[PDB]
RNA sequence: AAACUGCGAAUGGCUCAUUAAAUCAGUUAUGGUUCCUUUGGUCGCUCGACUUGGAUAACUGUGGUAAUUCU
RNA sequence: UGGUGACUCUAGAUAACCUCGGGCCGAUCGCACGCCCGGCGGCGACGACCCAUUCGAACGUCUGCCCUAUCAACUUUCGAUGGUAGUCGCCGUGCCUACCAUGGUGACCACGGGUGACGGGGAAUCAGGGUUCGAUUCCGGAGAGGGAGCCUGAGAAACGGCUACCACAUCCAAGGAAGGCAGCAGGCGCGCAAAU
RNA sequence: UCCCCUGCUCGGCGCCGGCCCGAAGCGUUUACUUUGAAAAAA
């Protein structure tokens, strides 16, 4: 390869893009943006598979540049725009908004939210920088460079930004006893409380997260998103509240639903 | 007789049309033509009979069911703005050019072979 | 890089001994008893029974009180109850290996058509299925190797298009009626 | 916009520096208390 | 339409000749460097014209070579 | 000021530099209309030094490749091993220069040769262990007759880009001019062997 | 089938300069063994 790739095969797509095999050779390669290729979700994939508003690749384009869809308060006219974690998407005419949260399994889930919760967005700070004339800077996980932050924002905190002004309203400090969830790996979408944080000099610093029912698991430092201060979550959690039901309880719940439905 | 039960209804305010799946139950008859099921969707969904577009009819084994797609728009010109043109060619509301691909490719190559004003005249 | 399937497998196996007396007598007895066409069908039933027995043995050699053992064991028992080769009394993993080709062969649609009384012989049941006369839960079946479930046993009746269960008469009826009209004038 | 955000950051930095200085003086007083008692 | 300007042709497709710690696979690092496009920030921070210049296309006219997506 | 396990890190101050083949600090375009005494406004499109991000690429760390002793020693001022100081390169580095010391690998198989060797995810058979294959749809690498050199461009030693060599080859008024199907169809040769 | 037989510089679960709990930071090294992270899809 003499340059960057511009195509992407269907079976080379990530599994959480949640496609089929016998439809086409290629898959939608997203345009470059705030999020990585294997951690985002194209707008065409959502509008054509999840919401079922469109069936072909031209109907998605018509809806997309018809100026009907707004992305974090800004209208976007790219059908392969990368949408990732807590990307607030809004439809102005039928009055629906969706928040992208990983569910109990390894995928995205549709989650309708009220507009009052659609005005803000929780996002994770990545690194702290100092500008030219002594301006402190923040680099956010969706590449939002924010000037003049609060002095108590550290490396692995979570800030809440209003989508109309771009400023910080409130923040959550990285500490034990806070509600957390994991973004990537074998664990995905489980909601838990940070207990331990093991420090290894020169490598990945693993942590330990306990679920609300008695389960525990260990993830890396980069696989951390802090969502709450204590037990109350700052956003509306999806169905099941991220408990990671095992296969026996899942089978029992499906059998109970089948017996009750008839 | 033949009767219709629509399935998987939804509306689409993003594109001013109504998605549903139509299953056609015709015991003893053949496959229904698309015009007559368009008249049934007209007399059922209280709209004009020239705005409804149906396609994708697939018969079942034994000949009792026939499921497929069918779309109802709010108005005729709203349907003309956002629809594939070949379905309008099926329904007689559109005409397309009858030129083959090799003739167009040869004309494009012969236009590439010359420069200037003569490009518009070498290809007829 | 065309987008196709390229996924296939063989459903039957051929024994290593081609010419033995007792084996050929046993498959001939099975074929002549249950009205089958060739030995490929009983070979494929032997293949799927060997697969089920191998899966049950692989689950039995794993230790007790493990979630995978319980999950695949209860899945296999629910599946084989749904076929109808077992009852709820023998709902055990070790009772899977005491099965037979006979229990898998009684669940054929041809055997059920002959057993209930739609047909007079097993070969007549096969050719009755082949001319599209037998339907179940409002869907006609034209194939004899259909595995009916336990809940699907009581829905077996004649079709609404077959002349046997009420419908348009066939080719020989209308031809003999036209011949009678020609003879009568 | 630059002048407004610079003024707001200067005010917030002054408040947080005053709070940190008060906590440092409290820690110095605690050290003096544990030295005396 | 033509043509100037800008962008893409370095993607895709076909083959297995070379290559035996070379390629590649898992695991690390760039605190040892460049990065089209998109995204966010910066874009009156510097103390010193109510819009400037001439060249080429396309076009017109006139030609050579037996011959070119030539001039 | 702020951070890392760790800076000759970022920020701050002083004194200067700032390349004529020269860093930026807008001599660009469209829609809807306008308030307040000629000045003054809303939403966009394009372009731009720097900074992070996205797509990556590239160089390195640890471990793992088929056969052969009728290959037992190999490399070494035609860089082989390391040190100093430089050139060049986007960066470290004998990558290359000038000077120093004789170093480095090897019976735990180096080196040399062969391969009907692209590598892996995988396929066949299979009680338990194994044996054989993997040109072939997804990933990475290499080439467009075969070596060599280069313009443009962010990214090419590109070949449906260019320049000379040889093998082969087209047209011609004989002066010259024009090319590389291991792309899709198709044809010849080669064949036991493979389509519009 | 349950619990007990490596030492030391700062603090929150409790009290009246005195006790327990925890922790910035260190504890003879290997193979073997069990768990955890990550380990593209098909």
Q: 3-state SS of C14-83?
A: CCCCCCCHHHHHHHHHHHHHHCCCCHHHHHHHHHHHHHHHHHHHHHHCCCCCCHHHHHHHHHHHHHHHHH
* Chain B residues touching residue A62 (CB < 8 angstroms): 15, 82
Residues A57 and A27 sit within 8 Å (Cβ to Cβ): no
Q: Name beta bridge partners: B52.
A: B72
Rounded to the nearest 5°, which phi and psi values hold at B86? -70, -30
Backbone φ/ψ region at B109: left (φ over 0), alpha (ψ -120 to 50), beta: alpha
Handedness of CA C119, C124, C128, C129 (dihedral sign): positive
- The residue ranges of every structural domain in chain B are 3-123
Q: Name beta bridge partners: B21.
A: B7, B69
Is C159 inside any structural domain? yes
Comparing C-alpha atoms, which of A127, A216, A134 is closest to residue A180?
A216
Question: Per the CB < 8 Å rule, is A25 touching C1?
Answer: yes
- What distance in Å separates the CA atoms of residue B82 and residue B78, rounded to the nearest whole number? 7
CA A117 to chain centre: 16
- What distance in Å separates the CA atoms of residue C18 and residue A16, rounded to the nearest whole number? 51
- What distance in Å separates the CA atoms of residue B99 and residue B102, rounded to the nearest whole number? 9
HEC states along A31-45?
CCCCCCCCCCECHHH
Mutate to test the interface with B, among A59, A69, A75 (most CBs of B within 10 A): A59
Give the helix/strand (H/E) hosting D27: helix D2-36
- What distance in Å separates the CA atoms of residue A224 and residue A197, rounded to the nearest whole number? 11
- From the CB of residue A53, how many other CB atoms can be counted at a distance below 10 Å? 22
- What distance in Å separates the CA atoms of residue C118 and residue C134, rounded to the nearest whole number? 9
- What distance in Å separates the CA atoms of residue A197 and residue A155, rounded to the nearest whole number? 15
Q: Name beta bridge partners: A69.
A: A91
Task: Give the domain extent around C43.
Answer: 18-185
Is C31 inside any structural domain? yes
Is C8 inside any structural domain? no
- What distance in Å separates the CA atoms of residue D29 and residue D27, rounded to the nearest whole number? 5
Q: How many residues are given for chain C?
A: 185
Task: Note the CA–C1' distance, B112 to F172, in angstroms.
Answer: 26
Task: Note the CA–C1' distance, A131 to F48, in angstroms.
Answer: 20
Counting CB pairs under 8 A, whether chains A and B reach 3 or more, is yes
SS3 A240: coil
Is C128 inside any structural domain? yes
SS3 B2: coil
Question: Per the CB < 8 Å rule, is C140 touching B27?
Answer: no
This PDB structure is determined at a resolution in Å of 3.7
User: Which positions 12-71 on chain A have a beta carbon less than 7 angstroms from any atom of strand F?
Assistant: 12, 25, 32-38
- Token match 């950051």: residue? D9
For A135, the closest chain D residue by CA position comes to: D6
Task: Note the CA–C1' distance, C77 to E49, in angstroms.
Answer: 91
Angle at which helices C21-34 and C39-60 pack, to 10 degrees? 100
Comparing C-alpha atoms, which of B25, B16, B34 is closest to residue B72?
B16
Tell me how many degrees the CA angle C33-C35-C40 measures, rounded to the nearest 5: 105
DSSP per-residue letters across A50-105: IS---SSHHHHHHHHTTT-EEETTEE---TT--B-TT--EEETTTTEEE--EE-SS
- What distance in Å separates the CA atoms of residue B16 and residue B80, rounded to the nearest whole number? 12
- What distance in Å separates the CA atoms of residue A138 and residue A125, rounded to the nearest whole number? 7
Burial class, C159, CB count within 10 angstroms (exposed 0-12 / middle 13-18 / buried 19+): buried
Task: Note the CA–C1' distance, A200 to E26, in angstroms.
Answer: 22
Tokens for A116?
Answer: 């009052």
Residues C139 and C156 sit within 8 Å (Cβ to Cβ): no
Is C5 inside any structural domain? no
User: Which positions 215-244 on chain A have a beta carbon less than 7 angstroms from any atom of strand F?
Assistant: none
Instruction: Count up the domains in chain C and report the number.
Output: 1
Q: Name beta bridge partners: A215.
A: none
- What distance in Å separates the CA atoms of residue A73 and residue A81, rounded to the nearest whole number? 15
Residue A84, CB, strand F, below 7 Å? no
Residue A200, CB, strand F, below 7 Å? no
Q: How many residues are given for chain D?
A: 37
Residues A17 and A6 sit within 8 Å (Cβ to Cβ): no
Q: Which of residues 5-64 of B touch C (CB under 8 A)?
A: 27-28, 60-64
Is C117 inside any structural domain? yes
Residues C104 and C44 sit within 8 Å (Cβ to Cβ): no
Q: Which fold has domain B3-123?
A: Alpha-Beta Plaits (3.30.70)
Residues A73 and A161 sit within 8 Å (Cβ to Cβ): no
- What distance in Å separates the CA atoms of residue A186 and residue D18, rounded to the nearest whole number? 46
Question: Per the CB < 8 Å rule, is B64 touching C135?
Answer: no
Residue A155, CB, strand F, below 7 Å? yes
SS3 A138: strand
Mutate to test the interface with B, among A53, A54, A75 (most CBs of B within 10 A): A53
End-to-end distance of chain A based on CA atoms, in angstroms? Answer: 57
Any D CB within 8 A of A252 CB: no
- From the CB of residue C32, how many other CB atoms can be counted at a distance below 10 Å? 11
- What distance in Å separates the CA atoms of residue A109 and residue A102, rounded to the nearest whole number? 6
- What distance in Å separates the CA atoms of residue C7 and residue C5, rounded to the nearest whole number? 5
Comparing C-alpha atoms, which of C182, B21, B121 is closest to residue A52?
B21
Burial class, A89, CB count within 10 angstroms (exposed 0-12 / middle 13-18 / buried 19+): buried
- What distance in Å separates the CA atoms of residue A94 and residue A169, rounded to the nearest whole number? 29
Handedness of CA C152, C153, C154, C155 (dihedral sign): positive
Q: What Å distances lie between residue A194 and A173, A181, C20, C160, CA to CA?
A: 12, 9, 70, 66
């Amino acid at each position: 390869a003499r340059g960057p790739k511009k195509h992407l095969k269907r079976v080379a797509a990530p599994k959480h893009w949640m496609l089929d095999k016998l439809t086409g050779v290629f898959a939608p390669r997203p345009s470059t943006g705030p999020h990585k290729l294997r951690e985002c979700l194209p707008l065409i994939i959502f509008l054509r598979n999840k919401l079922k508003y469109a069936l072909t690749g031209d109907e998605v384009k018509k809806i997309c540049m018809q100026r009907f869809i707004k992305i974090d308060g800004k209208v976007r006219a790219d059908i392969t725009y990368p949408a990732g974690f807590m990307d607030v998407i809004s439809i102005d005419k039928t009055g629906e908004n969706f928040r992208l949260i990983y569910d109990t399994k390894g995928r995205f889930a549709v989650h309708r939210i009220t507009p009052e919760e659609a005005k803000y967005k929780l996002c994770k700070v990545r690194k702290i920088f100092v500008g030219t004339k002594g301006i402190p800077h923040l680099v956010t996980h969706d590449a939002r460079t924010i000037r003049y932050p609060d002095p108590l924002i550290k490396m692995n905190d979570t800030i809440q930004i209003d989508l109309e002004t771009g400023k910080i309203t409130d923040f959550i400090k990285f500490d034990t006893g806070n509600l957390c969830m994991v973004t990537g790996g074998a664990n995905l979408g489980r909601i838990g409380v940070i207990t331990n944080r093991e420090r290894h000099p020169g490598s990945f610093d693993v942590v330990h997260v306990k679920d609300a029912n008695g389960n525990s698991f260990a993830t890396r430092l980069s696989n951390i998103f802090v969502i709450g201060k204590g037990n109350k979550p700052w956003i509306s959690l999806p169905r099941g509240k991220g408990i990671r039901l095992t296969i026996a309880e899942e089978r029992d719940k499906r059998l109970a639903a089948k017996q009750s439905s008839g | 007789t033949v009767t219709i039960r629509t399935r998987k209804f939804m509306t689409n305010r993003l594109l001013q049309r109504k998605q549903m799946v139509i299953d056609v139950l015709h015991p003893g008859k053949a496959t229904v033509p698309k015009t007559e099921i368009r008249e049934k969707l007209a007399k059922m969904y209280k709209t004009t009979p020239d705005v409804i577009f149906v396609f994708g009819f697939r018969t079942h084994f034994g000949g009792g069911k026939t499921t497929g797609f069918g779309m109802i728009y709010d108005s005729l010109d709203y349907a003309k703005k956002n629809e594939p043109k070949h379905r309008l060619a099926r329904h007689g509301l559109y005409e397309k050019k009858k030129t083959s691909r090799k003739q167009r490719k040869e004309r494009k190559n012969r236009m590439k072979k010359v420069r200037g004003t003569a490009k518009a005249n070498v290809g007829a | 890089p065309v987008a196709r399937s390229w996924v296939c497998r063989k459903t039957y196996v051929t024994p290593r001994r081609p010419f033995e007396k007792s084996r050929l007598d046993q498959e001939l007895k099975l074929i002549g008893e249950y009205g089958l066409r060739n030995k490929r069908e009983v070979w494929r039933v032997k293949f799927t029974l060997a697969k089920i027995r191998k899966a049950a043995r692989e689950l039995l050699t794993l230790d007790e009180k493990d979630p995978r053992r319980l999950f695949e064991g209860n899945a296999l028992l629910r599946r084989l109850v749904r076929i109808g080769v077992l009852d709820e009394g023998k709902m055990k993993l070790d009772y899977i290996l005491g099965l037979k080709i006979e229990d898998f062969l009684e669940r054929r649609l041809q055997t059920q058509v002959f057993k209930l009384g739609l047909a007079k012989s097993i070969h007549h049941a096969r050719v009755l299925i082949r001319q599209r006369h037998i339907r179940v839960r409002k869907q006609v079946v034209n194939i004899p190797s259909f595995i009916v479930r336990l809940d699907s046993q009581k829905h077996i009746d004649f079709s609404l298009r077959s002349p046997y269960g009420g419908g348009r008469p066939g080719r020989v009826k209308r031809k003999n009626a036209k011949k009678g009209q020609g003879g009568a004038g | 916009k630059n002048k407004e955000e610079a003024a707001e950051y200067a005010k917030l930095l002054a408040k947080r520096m005053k709070e940190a200085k008060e906590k440092r003086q409290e820690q110095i007083a605690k050290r003096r208390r544990l030295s005396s008692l």
